Each structure stands twice: as structure tokens, then as C-alpha cells.
């Protein structure tokens, strides 16, 4: 019998009404709320209190910002992966949320876990793949796939009948996800790809026309593929991301307006802000061009899409991911050095780089190489004498 349920709790109206909903559809069930700090810059104590006031017996707040950076964002930087060559993969946070949920579930000996992902997007897949990979014995409850609530107004009606406070402010005009790595904006007038990005979307990035008229120099030190210092100051991953997000955001850097293919459904138009991510991706690419051999670089670049698809689809916890990580970690052993960049009006402008492991340093040799490199073409053309290309 289901006596205890752990709920991944966002503090929004949806997951708040899920608490009484769970307690009514699973008679006499206790609900434990799990709240993750990933950098959404919300009042987590207020969210904790709302969980308790909504009927949760316990409400955990776990600060996972450093673990997000070191265990997820740093492997992502090392991979250089961009989904469909465009999307910065901020939904990499979903496996971590699932992992904290399962960890507390097992510590609290709950009979089931629940999440608030809707029945329409990829997020439900990302959560439930991760839960099954970490704890295949745990029952999963997805109230959006079971209940009769279909609109916000219907959720409001339910909240009133079940003692749940309805916030005064409306949900944003756009559906948003926010962590230390990115901010996403979807829905509303954004669903029409024929329409330009409205001027009220951006939250952490200055519009390019409102950026300083003087460039800003940043110097990034990397060790084994990840940044360890900014402007000569060693900083924790979170402090470095925070500082670079502010600096690059002030200079308007990193906004992506893209259409991407979902796994679940068709296509989605979104706006994605990630100033620090764009700067780190640029610096990392620069250093790899100096420190990797041609064959290593080419093989690694050919695996980036595989890595991006895996992360995008929520397959973080899989042996396939572990094997890619092992490959990537070897390629990163010498990606160590210094990159200077100028930030200016939405541009990340290279301003020099160096590495102790830089690989950058006869005429008769060339002729021999040419003759053998082109021998196949010569034989083919002799065989197909007079043929066209």
C-alpha cells in the first residue's frame, strides 16, 4: 500500500495542488516535498513554507548548485555539445532533480515518487527515464497524465476547494525554466516562428542595442577542459558562472532564438539565454583547436551530436553516457591554458590564447605526400577516362 510519496516540488500552483490531490487519490498518504536550488533565484524558504502549508509532512530544500556545475555543466562544457547545433541544453537539470528526488525517496522509504511535468513536453520523459535508471522499483505518479485538470482556471478552481493559496501575480506570459546555466522562454506568441522575439522576453541579458560602448576583456584559465579562474582569480564553478553570466549578460551575449525538434511531439520555438555558457563554449573550442590533434578533434566533434541527443532526451543515467564521458575525459587531459576574449555588443571576440600543451609551433616531402594522397583519384580518373564529376 502507498503510505508515503516524495514529490518534486516547484512551488508553482500545479505542484501545490498536487499535494492534496495525491493525498486524496492515495488514501492516507503522506507527501514529502523535495525542493532543489539550481539557481532559479527564487525565495526557497517561501516555497518550503508553501509546501508545508499545502499539506506536505516534510519539505526538503537541497542546494545542488555546485553539484549541478561540477557533475553536469562541466561534463557538458567538456563535450562541446549543442543540440541540433543550436540549443545549449539547459534541461540537463532534469536528471539532477530526479536524482535528488530518488535519493530522498530511498532515505524516507517512500512507496512512490511524483513529479509535476505536463503530459505534452519532453520533461516527463527526462524525469521518468532518470527515475527508472536510478530506482526501477519505485512507482511513479504523474498527476498531469491522470487528473481531470486541463487549464490554469481549472487548477484555480481545484485550489480554492482544497485550501491551496492562489498567488496574486499571474504566470508569466511565457513558460520559463531558470537555472545557473540558462533561462528558457517558450509558449505564448513565441509559438509562431514568423514573429520576431518580443521586447519583454529577456530576463538576464541586455538587448544588444543597450550594451556598453566600451568592450570588456575577460581572461579564462582552463584545466583539463574546465574553467578554474576568471581574470586571474580562482573561483568556484558557481562563482565563475555567476560572474561570467553578469559580465556577458551586460554585453548582450548569448541569446538563441531557435526552432528545435522535440523527442515527444513536433517542433518548438524557444528563446534561450545563456551568457556564461556561450563564453565558456567559445573559450573551450579555442583551446581544443590548440591542444588536440586533428584526428582527436575530428573524432570528438563527430560524437558531439550523439552526446547532445543523449542529454536532450534525458538519457543521462546510462552506460552509453558513461562510455562517452570516458572518451571525452581522455581528450580533455591537455585542454589546459589561457584564453582572452573581448565582450562587446553581443560578440565574443578572440583576443589571444596560450597553452603549455599547444601543438602550434620540406618541399620534397610535400611532393611525395601529394602523389600518394592523390593516387586513388588518378587511378579512378584513368579507369573512368573522360568521365565527369
Amino acid at each position: 500500500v502507498i503510505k508515503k510519496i516524495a514529490l518534486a516540488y516547484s512551488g508553482g500552483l500545479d505542484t501545490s495542488i498536487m499535494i492534496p490531490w495525491l493525498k486524496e487519490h492515495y488514501e492516507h498518504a503522506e507527501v514529502i516535498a523535495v525542493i532543489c536550488d539550481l539557481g532559479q533565484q527564487e525565495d526557497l524558504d517561501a516555497i518550503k513554507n508553501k509546501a508545508l502549508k499545502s499539506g506536505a509532512s516534510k519539505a526538503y530544500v537541497v542546494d545542488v548548485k555546485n553539484e549541478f556545475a561540477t557533475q553536469y555543466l562541466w561534463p557538458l562544457v567538456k563535450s562541446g555539445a549543442l543540440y541540433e547545433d543550436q540549443y545549449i541544453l539547459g534541461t540537463i537539470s532534469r536528471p539532477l532533480i530526479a536524482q535528488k528526488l530518488v535519493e530522498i525517496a530511498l532515505t524516507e522509504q517512500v512507496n512512490a515518487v511524483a513529479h509535476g511535468a505536463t503530459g505534452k513536453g519532453n520533461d516527463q520523459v527526462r524525469f521518468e527515464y532518470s527515475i527508472k535508471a536510478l530506482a526501477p522499483q519505485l512507482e511513479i505518479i504523474a498527476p498531469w497524465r491522470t487528473w481531470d485538470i486541463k487549464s490554469r482556471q481549472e487548477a484555480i478552481v481545484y485550489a480554492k476547494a482544497h485550501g491551496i493559496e492562489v498567488p496574486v501575480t499571474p504566470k508569466a506570459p511565457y513558460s520559463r525554466d531558470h537555472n545557473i546555466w540558462y533561462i528558457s522562454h517558450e509558449g505564448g506568441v513565441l509559438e509562431d516562428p514568423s514573429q520576431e522575439m518580443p521586447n519583454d522576453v529577456l530576463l538576464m541579458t541586455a538587448p544588444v542595442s543597450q550594451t556598453p560602448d566600451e568592450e570588456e576583456v575577460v581572461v579564462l584559465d582552463f584545466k583539463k577542459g574546465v574553467p578554474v579562474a576568471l581574470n586571474g582569480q580562482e573561483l568556484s564553478p558557481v562563482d565563475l558562472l555567476n560572474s561570467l553570466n553578469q559580465k556577458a549578460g551586460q554585453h548582450g551575449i548569448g541569446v538563441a532564438d531557435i526552432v528545435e525538434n522535440r523527442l515527444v511531439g513536433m517542433k518548438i520555438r524557444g528563446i534561450y539565454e545563456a551568457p556564461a555558457a556561450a563564453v565558456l563554449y567559445k573559450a573551450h573550442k579555442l583551446l581544443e583547436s590548440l591542444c588536440l590533434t586533428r584526428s582527436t578533434l575530428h573524432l570528438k566533434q563527430s560524437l558531439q551530436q550523439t552526446y547532445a541527443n543523449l542529454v536532450y532526451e534525458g538519457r543521462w543515467f546510462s552506460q552509453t553516457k558513461q562510455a562517452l564521458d570516458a572518451f571525452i575525459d581522455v581528450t580533455q587531459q591537455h585542454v589546459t591554458g589561457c584564453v582572452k576574449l573581448k565582450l562587446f555588443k553581443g560578440n565574443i571576440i578572440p583576443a589571444g590564447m596560450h597553452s603549455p600543451y599547444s601543438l602550434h609551433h620540406n618541399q620534397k616531402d610535400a611532393e611525395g605526400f601529394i602523389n600518394l594522397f592523390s593516387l586513388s583519384a588518378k587511378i579512378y580518373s584513368q579507369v573512368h577516362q573522360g568521365g565527369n564529376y
Copy 2:
């Protein structure tokens, strides 16, 4: 016996002195100069007269700008290829130069062809692969690999001794290549990747600090993957490239400061200007995200590197390339529509797109998909109970 030689002639000092050198090292050999207009914006009449003055019996001048755009740049645009995810592949001009050299060689009954590529770069490979692929029976002469001339100073001594005009004008600070698609800058202080780009490199692209304070809207119409109209005006490929190069260059767009792996040698640091190419690449990528299925998009993106490497290495005239083109052409059948872009201070900002072939338009279905998509992960975790990722 070598009675006739066709030379790919640029009008520079090197290929100018090759004319008397060829005539002296092959007694009673006649030298035919071949001059291609690829958009280098030089005085072609002067180059022709200089070839004849230097001792060429004939000097062909061929305007190949439309052939370059329609037979090389348009397939490149359709491919979406960027070498090592950075380089716009302006050396795609080398197979076309070789193609015209061979076409004229064969109508002139020449015994050998010559080119002025140095013994150190990739260009000798690109030229000679193409010549062997198109005319394996033609002997190739590369005087940079043969003669006793070692320095530019030595080439000047030789030129004076043979009546070749050498005006006092200092050595260019950078080695440059220029066609309708791009400008490359290499050598000199650019060789050191720790050194920022000097402020005298750029020739067709405004530094971002001097770009207009008002954005410029461009509207591009594509048909089957290639642009056919700009701002509602149907334009030839050459006119469209010229117009877009001017507009995007004024707004500072398209400069790449990169380190790449050579085929012959190690790494090279270069600055590349390609304003129209950057805009076309952006618009093409946007339209592909709207018009291709996920499976077609992912497969095509996985072949971009193969195509880029093939173009970079000079393997244009190969059955491998023909097979890639046939693949790409199918994927481009519906890449038709309109992309609006804002050009502003080095940025290409999406401003809306639409296509008659846009692919952008249940809760129980999702649950079934989730369960089968995650089934392997569930089984794997049950088998490896207690294991980590």
C-alpha cells in the same frame, strides 16, 4: 617534348617570374597564362597585359563568378558545412581554378600545367588532386618545389634580371586570398595565436565599434536550399552575394579568428571575412530547422563534417563528393521559404521565418511512449541493482 605549358596566373611576382622560368627550363616551350575572375576585384586587363609582357604567348581571362557561385558556393550553402565547426571554406575556389586550367589546357593541346602554390601549404594538394582527377595524363609542374629561388628577395632579383616589373611597395603584412565568398588573412604576426588580431587586418568588414547604430532588416527568399531574392528583389547569385557582402560587412558581420588543422603540416591561425556567407548560413540553418524532419536533420548534420573535410582537403572532384551531393540535394527539395534577419553590430538576429513546407504546427499516448522508451533503462537497472552511473 614539352612544347606548351598552361599556367594558372595571378599577376603577382611569383607567377610572373614563373613565365620566364618555365620558358628557360623547357627549351622552345610556349607558356599560356590562365586568369580567372573569382571576385578578387583586381584589374584583370593589367594582369593579362603583364602576362603577355612577361613572355606568355596567350593570356586567357575567364569570368567565372557565376560558375563559382552556382556550381561551388550554392552546393556549399546547401551542405551547411564548416570545417572544424569554424572555417567557411573559401579555398573551395581551388578546384574551380584547376578546372579552368585543365579546360583550357585541353583545348590548347598543352603537354603540362603549372601552378604557383608554394611548397608549404595545402593549396598545392588542392590544385594537384584536382588536376589528377580531371586530367590524369597531364604533367604537373610546381616551380616552387623545383627552382633555386628561396626568398622573396631572391624572386625580386630574378624578376629584375628578366624584365619583370617590380615596383617599390613593401611586402604585405599578411598573406591574403580574396574572392566573392571570403577574404583570408594569414602569416606575419597572425602566426602567433597568443596575439590579438591587429587593427589593420580587415578589408571588407567594419570593426564592430564603427558599425551603424541602427539595425538593418534583410529578407531572404530561398528555393530548394539556395537564396533567390533579397528584400523582395530577385537577384542573380553574384548580385545577391555582392549586395549581402556590402550590407553585412557594413554591420561588421562574419569575422572568424581561428586556428585550424592543415592537411599538410600542423596548425594555422587565420582571420577570415565572409559577411554574406555568415548571413546565408544563418538563414539556411533556420529554414532547415523548420522544413526537415528530426531524422533528416540529424543525419544531414552528421555528414556536414565529412563534406567540410572533403572540401578542405581539395577532394571536390571525387565520386565521394558526388554521392554526398545527391544526398544533400534530396534534403534540400523543400528548403523553400522566407527568412527575415536583423543585421546589427556584428550580430545576425532572427526576425521571423515562414515556409509553405513548415513542419511546425494525447496524455495517454505520452505514458505509453515513456514506458517503452525507458524500458531498456529499467531492465538494465534491475539487472545491475545497486550500481552507479
Copy 3:
């Protein structure tokens, strides 16, 4: 209101009882049976008559052996694809069955189509993906996913109560699929991979221990990647497949005992017979090794898996497949020549090959090629002085 239903009809118990089931669950609905000849070597007039006896208003028998060979098997031979490097892809018949069902559906102006695939295998995916690709407006009815019949014995009870002949013949020990390309055997004791293949599985391939003691020479002529003659006799595709299946089957060739990953579900063990396929695949691989450049061969081999997965998953009718076919077709332009093979006790033994397009025909060149090919390795080893591999 559903007035007409087209059903893909095999004559087996399942699709036989689907006729009365459909007629009872869609009142006043007429059922049109569609029977395809793919080489299953059954009495199709008997199947036709049985559909009519069970209440079908029309029963089509479509002879698609020729088109199966030239439109499906010939592209497959040209691709060289084997699913997971093992499986000969006999389920390539499913899109063709769906295609014929849809053509008749459209002609007869039916309101829905039906197929008899179970709710457990990949086949339901292959059928329904194809129907959606060809006729997105047609409703699909899958009785296995709807009716109250759970077991074969329940199906038998249902048949007797609806006038359908079920004579006493025992349950087949294996589930089988048979067409001109292959025979599959699955289920029963084959489900356990720790159990060797029982001695009563094979139907068209002799056990190796009873094969002739004298080898048999076969000579295959290929044109543009497909076989056109056998032992100097030009034969239609179906005649050549029939003859080669007989000859190679007599000599015990082509049995695969394999475990494969499904798309829907986990893993499946099956026995697959395909004697002619194995011989054609061998001859095709030999001719490619003679006629393709290294770069073309390597790229095509890299795409075999993509092609195999696409065919395996039922994605035949897709732009992705069209683009792959255009690639493959270029690579096959010169795969033309003669291959002699000795068939002997399960072995396909090369006995010589030749082609008018065969590509098979200095010390100073080698030194130059070696030095440039190994230059990156030398530089890397100097930078990482003393490091290990």
C-alpha cells in the same frame, strides 16, 4: 460512420476471425481483404476464397514479388546493410504490405484500414508508420489492441462460433514469416538463448551435415550494384532469387542464429534463413571492394547502420530514406562486373572476380608521405615528452 474497412489479410487464424469481429464491432461495415504475394509459397486462391467465405465483400490478391525484389530487395542489396551487423531485414516486406493496403483503401474509398499485427512486436510499428506516411487521413484499426481475445485457444473458440474453419492441427512450435528473401523463426524454445537451435527449425536450408560433398560454382553478373545474370543466363530478379535460394539452400548457406534489440520491447532470439541473400551480399561486398575508392567505401560503410536501423524500424517511407537512396545510387554506378563463388557446406568461397571498372592495377614519394602523415604524432610526442599511450 465507418462503412468500409480494408484489412491486410494473411489467411491465418488471427486475420481470419478479424473479418467477423470487424463486421460486428462496426455495424453495417463492409470488409475488403487484401492479400499480398511476397513469395510465402502458400495457396493464395485458397486464402482468397476463405476471406470471401468469412464475409469479406471483396478479396484482392496482389502479386508483388517482382516489385518487392526491384523496389525493396535491390535497394537493400545495394546498401549492404545488416541490422546490428547480423540481421538480413526480411521485415522489409512490411512497408510494401502497407503500401498495397493503402492503394486499395484509397481506390475503394474505405473509412479505415486494419492489420493483424499483435500488440507486442515491432510489426505494428512498421505497419502503422507506413500507413501514416502514405495516408495520414486514414483511421487505423488494430484488433489485437482492442478485442477481448487473449490466447490462441480463445481465438479458436471465437472462430468456431463465427463459422470459420479451424481444423485440428497442432500449434506450430515456432512463429514464422516467409517471403522470397528470408524465413524467420521465433518463439517457443527459441526464446531461451542458452538453448541451441533445435533440429526441426530450418525449412529451406539444409543442415550442414547433409549438404553435398562436391562444391557448386555459381557466377553472378552485377550491373549498377544488383545481380542481372546467374551462370551466364540473364534472369529476372525473382527468378534469380528463386534459383539462388535453391542452390545456396541445398549447400546449407545463410542461417543466422542471433539475438537482436527490438525497437518495441527488449531483445529477441530468432533463426533467420536467407541463402540467396547471403550469396548476393557476399558478391556485392567483393565487387564494391574492387570498384569503389577507399573514401567512397569507408563513407558508405559508415552509413550502412543508419540504413539498417531505418529499414528495421519501419521508416521506409521517409525523406531520410530517399536521401540515403540517392547517396547509395551514386556509389553503385560502377558496381558492375562478374563474381565467381564456390558454394560448399555452409561456406561461400571466393573463386575470382573482375570488372571493367576495377581500380585494382617511388621510394622518394613514400618518404615524403610518411613524414607528413606522421608529423602530428611527432609534434605531439615532442610536446608531451616522455608521456605514455
Copy 4:
């Protein structure tokens, strides 16, 4: 100055006359001979004595069979790599020979190393890539690229004039390479792919017609992707290879007659015997089909070609190979179990397998998966109404 040279010494006439040749072209140079036992089953004492009699100051004989099996063949087995899907990569011995040569050279204070690979094949590249990767400071001498000896008779003339014994028996009709993993046969009448393999080629494999009339069962136990026991008996890698080569060779297993693309040159026809390799590859492929997830299997199979090309080209000692190895080692963690095989008349017949990590063990779920899996095709077909595939 070059006072001391280490020579990779095979005992043949070529490397024997290289000893006086080296001493004459490098005045007063000492020559150290290095002889590797890789399983070529020759009289190594006679070879050592011939080296000393030919003028070597020292002749090292090193038994490297276990090092070859554990550090080269076992990684190859784990990779599953077959060059161009055909060639078993017995030239994997070349990096090991180069490794021993360099190891001894650095203990003997030699200034240069020499090898006897000819100026025509891939072997020179394999040797010299490895030497540069392991010891870029060592000068390399390849007498076949420098001396004036062009024929066997010219080598005999030189040997007579320089005190080198000429063997009574001729060189074999075929050029051969032999180690514990394989035997290769090339040259002679084998250069003609239209000609069947002659009946005097095979050395360790029975002709299929001369194999036992009763099958032989073998049972292989694998741990982490490599075999550890045969027929229930734990065996060292060398003993297991020796025993399996004998058993499978007696049953005629493992002969490949192929045409492959060289790196250096065009195409080469060879005969390759590797009985144990074929059996190990089969068993390994079987266990991977049981123990890996679909996504891991497909990704690993996509990297086999990259691995095969790397090995074939002699790039063993590279960071690219190290990164692949790290990938592979993760995938092999659970490739542990038992494979029973029947050996019979050239066939390797599966006879059951099991693993403690085997991954082999609803109707509403399937319908949801089908609808979402095929949604893209449905949307595409609605957009392109009336279009063909």
C-alpha cells in the same frame, strides 16, 4: 654522430644484408639486432646466430607473445573492429615491434633505428609513425628507400660480396606475415583478383573439404570482453589462442580472401588465416548482443570502423586511440559470460550462451509509443499531401 643503430631483424636475406649495408653507409657504426617472438614459429636461435654472423654486435631475442596478446589482441577483441568489414588486422603487430625496438634502443644508447619494411607497402608507415610517437628524437633509417638493391637477385649479389649467407631454399611463392593471431599471404599469382586462391597457400587451416565429419564443441568463458577459459579450463591468453588456433584450424575456419584498400598505394588482394580470431570475434559479438543496451551497441558498432582504420594505418600510439580504448573499456564492463559454439566444416555455429548480466528476459503502451514515434511522419505527409517516396 651515428655510432650505434638498432635494427628490427627478421632473419631474412633483406635484413641480413642490411647489417653490412648499415655499417658501410654509417662509418664505424655498431648494429644491434632486435628479434621479436610474436608466434612466427621460426628457429629464433638460428635467427640470432645469423644476425651475429652477419656483423651485429648483439642480437636480442624477446618473447613478446604474452605482451602481444594482452596489450594488443585483447583490446582488438574488445573493439570488434574489422578493417573494411573484412580484414582481421594482424598487422597490429607492427606497433609492438616498433615498441620493442625503441625500448631496447633507449637501453643501448643508440642514435638511430632501422627497419626492413619495403618502400611500397603500409608497413613502413606503421613502423615510422610508431617510432615518432614513442621516440621523436631517434633518427629512422629505411634502407629499402635508400639503397640500390631492387631485386632478389641483386640482394643475392650484394650478399655474396659482403659475406652474408644466402639460404638454399627460395623465398615462398607468397609474401607472408605470421604471428599468433594470423597468417597473411600476398603477392605472386594472388595479385590477380580474377584468379582463385591456389591450393598451396594455406599454412595453419585445413581446406574445408578436408575437415572432420563430426563437429567439435568449444565453450568459451569471457570476463570483461576477453576470453579467460576454454572448455572449462582457465588458460593464459597465449595458451588459449594456441589451443583455439589448432581446433578451429583443423575444422577449416577463418580463411578470408579479400581485396582491401591500402593507405599507401592502391588495392591489395590477400589471403588471411586466423582461426582463433574468427571464433573469438563470433563469441564476443554474441555476448555483446546479450549484455549491451541497444544504444550502447549501436554507438560502439559505429566506432568499430574508426578503430579499425586507426589500427590499419599504424596510429596505435595516439591520444585518439587512448580515447577510443577508454570508451571501449566502459562498454566491456559487463561483457561476461559463457558461449558454446560448434565448429564444423568452416562454420562457427552458435550452440547457446548465457551471462549473469544478460538483458534478455502492455498493449496500451504500444499504441502510445506508435502514435508518438510516427507523429513526425504523419505531420510530414499532411504537409506534403499527394507526394511520393
